Automatic annotation (TrEMBL), chain B:
Residue stretches making up the RNA polymerase subunit H/Rpb5 C-terminal domain: 136-208
Cellular compartments per GO CC: DNA-directed RNA polymerase complex; nucleoplasm
Source organism, top-level taxon: Eukaryota
Chief location bin: nucleus
Family according to the record: Belongs to the archaeal Rpo5/eukaryotic RPB5 RNA polymerase subunit family.
Species the sequence originates in: Sus scrofa (Pig)
Compartments where found: Nucleus
UniProt GO BP: DNA-templated transcription
Keyword Nucleus: yes
InterPro entries noted in UniProt: Arch_Rpo5/euc_Rpb5, RNA_pol_Rpb5_N, RNA_pol_Rpb5_N_sf, RNA_pol_subH/Rpb5_C, RNA_pol_subH/Rpb5_CS, RPB5-like_sf
Name under which the protein is recorded: DNA-directed RNA polymerases I, II, and III subunit RPABC1
Domain RNA polymerase Rpb5 N-terminal, chain residue ranges per copy: 3-93
Keyword Nucleotide-binding annotated: no
From TrEMBL, chain C:
All copies of domain RNA polymerase Rpb2, residue ranges: 1-173
Domain of life according to the entry: Eukaryota
Protein name: DNA-directed RNA polymerase subunit beta
Intracellular or extracellular location(s): Nucleus
Family recorded in the similarity comment: Belongs to the RNA polymerase beta chain family.
Phylogenetic classification of the source organism: Eukaryota, Metazoa, Chordata, Craniata, Vertebrata
Full protein segment contained here: 348 to 526 of 1300
Function: RNA-dependent RNA polymerase that catalyzes the extension of a non-coding RNA (ncRNA) at the 3'-end using the four ribonucleoside triphosphates as substrates. An internal ncRNA sequence near the 3'-end serves as a template in a single-round Pol II-mediated RNA polymerization reaction. May decrease the stability of ncRNAs that repress Pol II-mediated gene transcription. DNA-dependent RNA polymerase catalyzes the transcription of DNA into RNA using the four ribonucleoside triphosphates as substrates.
TrEMBL record, chain F:
Species name: Sus scrofa
Record gene name: POLR2B
The organism's place on the tree of life at top rank: Eukaryota
Biological role: RNA-dependent RNA polymerase that catalyzes the extension of a non-coding RNA (ncRNA) at the 3'-end using the four ribonucleoside triphosphates as substrates. An internal ncRNA sequence near the 3'-end serves as a template in a single-round Pol II-mediated RNA polymerization reaction. May decrease the stability of ncRNAs that repress Pol II-mediated gene transcription.
Portion held of the full protein: 646 to 705 of 1300
Location relative to the cell: Nucleus
Similarity comment text for this entry: Belongs to the RNA polymerase beta chain family.
The protein's name: DNA-directed RNA polymerase subunit beta
TrEMBL record, chain H:
Highest rank taxon of the organism: Eukaryota
Subcellular location: Chromosome; Cytoplasm; Nucleus
The name this protein goes by in its record: DNA-directed RNA polymerase subunit
Taxonomic lineage: Eukaryota, Metazoa, Chordata, Craniata, Vertebrata
Summary of the function given for this chain in its UniProt record: DNA-dependent RNA polymerase catalyzes the transcription of DNA into RNA using the four ribonucleoside triphosphates as substrates. RNA-dependent RNA polymerase that catalyzes the extension of a non-coding RNA (ncRNA) at the 3'-end using the four ribonucleoside triphosphates as substrates. An internal ncRNA sequence near the 3'-end serves as a template in a single-round Pol II-mediated RNA polymerization reaction. May decrease the stability of ncRNAs that repress Pol II-mediated gene transcription.
Coiled coil: none
Organism listed in the record: Sus scrofa (Pig)
Chain segments annotated as transmembrane: none
Residues of the full protein shown: 1115 to 1452 of 1984
Family statement: Belongs to the RNA polymerase beta' chain family.
Chain sites annotated for binding Zn(2+) 10: Y63
């Protein structure tokens, strides 16, 4: 990872524009749930 | 069978229409969605010893911005397209004064013919397409993401924003199926937008070189 | 693998193989599966009926008596039809030794040097455990016919292929044989 | 983005545990009416979303890159920090928010 | 389907055309002997290759100590109660675990399947 | 692993012998030799191998 | 209603088709013009094909062979009686429908057998033991992963396919 | 169906071998093909490669000098009937015939009409052969083949028909696509291969539809078939997916295969590492294997390339061409 | 034969299903038989070392032994050992403990 937050090799060729497509390291992340994917439309409207 | 080959011609015409729409040319909506029965009514029902003889399937299309771009498509009669057939097609290209064309070969053309396509390349753009390749649209596959062709000003703005040279971009070959579908050439940059598992959306730029 | 009862002739092995019918060609498709033999100190393979005729058995009925022990079994003869057709153009015994003698370690300058060299290969280096001297070539024909007969039984599926990891098929070289 | 309806997604900040921590720190009583305004919730979520920066710059390409990089986390944040769930489920106060 | 040899030099006879009498003949390739063909068929192969394995069972297997033997099925000719049984006992034998029965009686050897 | 092995407790390795008395006994008890054989008799007779060498046939 | 023609092949096919209808004396039994019926069949075949080529010839010969055979007599009876119209009889789709009842029965039975011939893939393990806690259905499969290691022991993870519920063996 | 998994599958994906051990297509179906097992069987027969040996019961060369001789006791009736009407054939004919019998179990299974087979064996070769055939009423289902009617107008004949008979059993395609040996059928019990649709009420619903699993890869022809789903049909062969669809598609496919071979064991790895590996493999527009032939053909320095695999040959080439080293 | 298998395949599948169901049932009975003071159960429940299949193999049934993912092959002529009789496909002959 270079200082433009791009991921480059020794030839300075761009492999990824951001690391992991989001620019986040792998230590601070956790499994979560969206809670907006797969309720029915009526239930989603009532809940939100 | 004859019905199978009629279906083959209809499906390959639909793929040509989708390709011409995706390349930026002007096609009608009903031309985009033709049914098998409508195609049979328009062109004939039995192509063997019958009306649709692979000659009347040539299509006139023009670009949206410029009405004089005037790209054609051609369906050669013989399965093995040669220098004689390509010379006839290029001479015809010369009197109707157009610059770009597609050739839909049945199975394959001769190496001398495909070299003559390279020799004729600067003045006239000739692209080889097999009938097996065009039997389905590869851009509708779930593996293939969306490809957008970038303009020169957009490429210049991109390289100025990221402070990059053209060498440092990822590459895509000119013989790539998507590259040949879009008719892209060397030096142009294609823009790929794909869904991301971690960030939702990710945009990748690839140089055709 | 054949040895002269652990007294001399350290390594002497023979391969009798049946080539596959998957070969793509006009000649390959018509014949079927031929049977070939690989002999020691010979550069390339030899057809199996050439070796039998080189031992002095000229008529193919005498060849098939040593290979097939019951002529009333019909399925056995179709596996040896292309072997006879491949070796059809050689009929005389000394021609067969000339055929084998052309494929030695070095080709002989004279023809009779090749025939003499092919004869001593079939005496000394061809199955030494059966015999080495004089009229043991008659005993060599039965064992060579037995090897072909065992090859046909595995090809017909009437016997199971031998597995190499069976340790009854192994011998232990102790200090005696080692020294 | 997600066919087959799979909701288990790896994301940096654990918003449910952060809400629980806020409830325990600020002694939130879930059986009393709150003093948190939904407009304050919406404006705070918007101003927080403007502060999670991955790609800098005011170029349109930079703005598109920022939106694409922070899309999934912003969707999760707006879903779990919405005004109805703040009023009815978590019942936070202004200081806790 | 069978192979017949020459009666002069004991070589293999080959089938060939008799173009005037319009009859199949077998002739030796190494001499001039010719023999009229009675079967009038030359080449045949059974692709499914279904064969009765009872012809491939030697009657001597009744003396094997390792084969199992049963008492429920008697022999058909001599009516002996004891008889050994075994499976197909060969490779490329398609898919069947069918038992083959051999009577273990002296001066017998009748073979039957069930 | 699996390439270096040890003998069992009561396992014994044969030391070797000469097949001449066995050949003499076999010849004295029938065992028609391959020189005196007719090829029609091999079908219904048991083949006899001594140290891997086919020496004759037998009928009992 | 048979349009006559001067083609030798056409009239010869008509007369073999008539002689095919002569088999079994069912034309005597019914009382129908077998020559006119065969001419009608041949005319309908010529309308279908518009040629005297291979498809014309082998279609005619297939109809002749399906007429003269003795194991399917009621087909000839229904053709001569008028139960099967001639224009339909010209276009019967080979033996899938122009057949006797026993051949159709064994074709259906072997069509049911080639179900069991070519499913394969050995997909389901067929547990059918654990009852679900959400949809209460026992059609489930189990998973054996995470062998040995420091902490995690082998715990069977069972999934119900119909409702998607997953519950640990515990 | 057996699938290679673990270290050998990982080695295949990393090396990008041109011949995997078990290359397969999952094939999805459209319309009523996905619901009716009869129509799915029709698609099965359309895709599976069928050689004439698979439908032939047994084959025999007879010698009938006369078409009215008929040394076979049963064929005399219809063989006259095709000689009652001599069609497209000179009555002068060679006396050597080849008659085959076709098994009924393998006939209705693959849904071939014998009229179609006689068309395929003739039009595939041309006017060089003659075939006379039956209807299926007889319990012995017979097709008899003769040589040139016009030859009599080397190689002999018996050798020639044996050369013909051994070629029909090997490489004559009657149905299906070659390099596809055997294709299966199953209703998927896992939501990964089931069809996921969003209902009108808005909840995710899984539908059981028939899918096909093959052995061998022809992705171009399978996708070009009218009956499959073009959107969702995919293989596990990296090179054919590349050459058919493109570099982005093969990057996504490589990511999917790596995730499958990792998560089959129940283990989990973060997405960033798989994404980085796939991006490094597909960065330069072609499949760059993690081998000497993939790594040492890059634009990296000679000192980078000498520490991996071939050490001295790299320095030979660099000294011969005078290649500088930027030392990054 | 079961859908999509030969006679050998369906026979081996049926016998392996019977043996695996027997091993699972015996293991479930053995695990139900354990008291609350059982040290094996303490070790397994804590997750420090051991597993339920280890408990089952200690107490009730070791189970079927497999070589190359398959039941014990006939290394001799159509028998696994000289102590067994020829063409014996029973559980004792083919390696079920
Ligand atoms: Zn002769
Ligand atoms: Zn008896
Ligand atoms: Zn699940
Ligand atoms: Zn004949």
């Amino acid at each position: 990872v270079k200082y433009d937050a791009t991921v480059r090799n020794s030839i300075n060729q761009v492999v990824q524009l951001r690391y992991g497509e989001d620019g986040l390291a792998g230590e601070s992340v956790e499994f979560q749930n969206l809670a907006t994917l797969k309720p029915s439309n009526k239930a989603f409207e009532k809940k939100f | 069978d004859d019905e199978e080959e009629t279906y083959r011609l209809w499906k390959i015409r639909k793929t040509i229409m989708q390709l011409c729409h995706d390349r930026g040319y002007l096609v009608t909506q009903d031309g985009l969605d033709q049914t098998l029965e409508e195609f049979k009514a328009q062109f004939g029902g039995k192509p063997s010893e019958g009306r649709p003889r692979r000659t009347d399937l040539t299509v006139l299309v023009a670009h949206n911005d410029d009405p004089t771009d005037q790209m054609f498509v051609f369906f050669p009669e013989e399965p093995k397209v040669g220098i004689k057939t390509i010379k006839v097609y290029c001479q015809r290209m010369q009197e109707e004064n157009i610059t770009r064309a597609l050739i839909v070969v049945q199975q394959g053309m001769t190496p001398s013919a495909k070299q003559s396509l390279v020799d004729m390349a600067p003045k006239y753009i000739l692209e080889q397409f097999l009938q097996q390749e065009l039997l389905i649209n590869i851009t509708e596959h779930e593996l293939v993401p969306e490809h957008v062709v970038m303009t020169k000003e957009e490429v210049t703005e991109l390289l100025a924003r990221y402070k990059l040279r053209e060498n440092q971009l990822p590459r895509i070959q000119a013989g790539d199926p998507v590259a040949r579908y879009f008719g892209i050439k060397r030096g142009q940059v294609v823009k790929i937008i794909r869904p991301s598992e971690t960030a939702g959306r990710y945009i990748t730029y690839r140089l055709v070189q | 693998r054949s040895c002269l009862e652990n007294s001399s002739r350290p390594t002497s092995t023979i391969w009798v193989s049946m080539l596959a019918r998957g070969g793509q060609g006009a000649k390959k498709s018509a014949i079927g599966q031929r049977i070939v033999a690989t002999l020691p100190y010979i550069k390339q393979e030899v057809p199996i009926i050439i070796v039998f005729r080189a031992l002095g058995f000229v008529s193919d009925r005498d060849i098939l008596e040593h290979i097939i022990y019951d002529f009333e079994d019909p399925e056995m003869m179709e596996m040896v039809k292309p072997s006879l057709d491949e070796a059809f153009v050689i009929q005389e015994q000394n021609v067969a030794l000339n055929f084998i003698g052309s494929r030695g370690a070095k080709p002989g300058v004279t023809k009779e040097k090749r025939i003499k060299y092919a004869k001593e290969v079939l005496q000394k280096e061809m199955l030494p455990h059966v015999g080495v001297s004089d009229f043991c070539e008659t005993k060599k024909a039965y064992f060579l016919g037995y090897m072909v007969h065992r090859l046909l039984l595995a090809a017909l599926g009437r016997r199971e292929l031998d597995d190499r990891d069976h340790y009854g098929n192994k011998r232990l070289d102790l200090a005696g044989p080692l020294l | 983005i997600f066919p087959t309806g799979d909701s288990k997604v790896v994301l940096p900040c654990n918003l449910l545990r952060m809400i629980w921590n806020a409830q325990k720190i600020f002694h939130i009583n879930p059986r009393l009416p709150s003093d948190l305004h939904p407009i304050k919730v919406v404006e705070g979520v918007k101003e927080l979303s403007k502060k999670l920066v991955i790609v800098n710059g005011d170029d349109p390409l930079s703005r598109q890159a920022q939106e694409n990089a922070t899309l999934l986390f912003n969707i999760h944040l707006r879903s779990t920090l919405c005004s109805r769930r703040m009023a009815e489920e978590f019942r936070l106060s202004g200081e806790a928010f | 389907v069978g192979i017949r040899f020459c009666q002069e030099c004991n070589n293999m006879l080959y089938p060939k055309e008799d173009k005037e009498n319009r009859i199949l003949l077998y002739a030796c390739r190494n001499c001039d002997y010719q023999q009229e063909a009675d079967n009038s068929c030359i080449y045949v192969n059974k692709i499914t290759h279904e064969v009765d394995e009872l012809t491939q069972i030697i009657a001597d297997v009744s003396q094997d100590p390792t084969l199992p033997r049963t008492e429920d099925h008697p022999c058909q000719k001599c009516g002996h109660k004891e008889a050994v049984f075994f499976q197909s006992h060969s490779a490329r034998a398609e898919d069947a675990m069918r038992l083959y029965y051999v009577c273990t009686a002296p001066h017998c050897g009748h073979r039957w399947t069930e | 692993v699996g390439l270096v092995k040890n003998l069992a407790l009561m396992a014994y390795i044969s030391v070797g012998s000469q097949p001449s008395p066995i050949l003499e006994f076999l010849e004295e008890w029938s065992m028609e030799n391959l020189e005196e054989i007719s090829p029609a008799a091999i079908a219904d007779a048991t083949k006899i191998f001594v140290n891997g060498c086919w020496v004759g046939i037998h009928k009992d | 209603r048979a349009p006559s023609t001067s083609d030798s092949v056409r009239l010869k096919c008509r007369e073999m088709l008539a002689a095919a209808l002569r088999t079994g004396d069912d034309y005597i039994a019914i009382g129908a013009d077998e020559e006119e019926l065969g001419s009608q069949i041949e005319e309908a075949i010529y309308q279908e094909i518009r040629n005297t080529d291979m498809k014309y010839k082998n279609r005619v010969r297939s109809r002749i062979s399906n007429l003269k055979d003795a194991k399917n007599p009621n087909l000839r009876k229904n053709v001569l009686c008028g139960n099967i119209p001639p224009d339909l009889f010209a276009r019967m789709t080979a033996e899938e429908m122009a057949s006797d009842e026993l051949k159709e029965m064994r074709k259906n039975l072997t069509k049911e057998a080639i179900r069991e011939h070519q499913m394969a893939k050995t997909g389901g393990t067929q547990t059918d033991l654990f009852t679900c806690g959400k949809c209460k259905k026992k059609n489930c499969t189990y998973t054996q992963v995470q062998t040995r290691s420091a902490d995690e022991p082998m715990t069977t993870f069972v999934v119900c396919n119909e409702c998607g519920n997953r519950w640990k063996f515990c | 169906k057996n699938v290679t998994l673990g270290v050998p599958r990982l080695k295949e994906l990393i090396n990008i071998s041109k011949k995997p051990k078990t290359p397969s297509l999952t094939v999805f179906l459209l319309g009523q093909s996905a619901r009716d097992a009869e129509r799915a069987k029709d698609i099965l027969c359309r895709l599976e490669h069928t050689t004439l040996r698979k439908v032939t019961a047994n084959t025999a060369i007879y010698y009938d000098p006369n078409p009215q001789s008929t040394v076979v006791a049963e064929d005399q009736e219809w063989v006259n009937v095709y000689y009652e009407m001599p069609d497209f054939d000179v009555a002068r004919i060679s006396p050597w015939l080849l008659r085959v019998e076709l098994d009924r179990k393998h006939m209705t299974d693959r849904k071939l009409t014998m009229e179609q087979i006689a068309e395929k064996i003739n039009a595939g070769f041309g006017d060089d052969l003659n075939c006379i055939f039956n209807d299926d009423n007889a319990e012995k289902l017979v097709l008899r083949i003769r040589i040139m009617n016009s030859d009599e107008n080397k190689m002999d004949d018996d050798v020639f028909l044996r050369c013909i008979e051994s070629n029909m059993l090997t490489d004559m395609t009657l149905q299906g696509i070659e390099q596809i040996s055997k294709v299966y059928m199953h209703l998927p019990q896992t939501d990964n291969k089931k069809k996921i649709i969003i209902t009108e009420d808005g909840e995710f619903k899984a539908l059981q539809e028939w899918i096909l699993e093959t052995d061998g890869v022809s992705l171009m022809r399978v996708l070009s078939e009218k009956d499959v789903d073009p959107v969702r049909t995919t293989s596990n062969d990296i090179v054919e997916i590349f050459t058919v669809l493109g570099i982005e598609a093969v990057r996504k496919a490589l990511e999917r295969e790596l995730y499958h071979v990792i998560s089959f064991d129940g283990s989990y790895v973060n997405y960033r590492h798989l994404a980085l590996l796939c991006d490094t493999m597909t960065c330069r527009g072609h499949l760059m294997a993690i081998t000497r032939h993939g790594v040492n053909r890059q634009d990296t320095g000679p000192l980078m390339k000498c520490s991996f695999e071939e050490t001295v040959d790299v320095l030979m080439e660099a000294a011969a061409h005078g290649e500088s080293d930027p030392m990054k | 034969p079961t859908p999509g298998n030969t006679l050998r395949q369906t026979f081996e599948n049926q016998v392996n299903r019977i043996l695996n169901d027997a091993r699972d049932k015996t293991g479930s009975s053995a695990q139900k038989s354990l008291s609350e003071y059982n040290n094996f159960k303490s070790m397994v429940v804590s997750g420090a070392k051991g597993s339920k299949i280890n408990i089952s193999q200690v107490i009730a049934v070791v189970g079927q032994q497999n070589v190359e993912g398959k039941r014990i092959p006939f290394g001799f002529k159509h028998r696994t050992l000289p102590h067994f009789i020829k063409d014996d496909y029973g559980p004792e002959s083919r390696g079920f403990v």
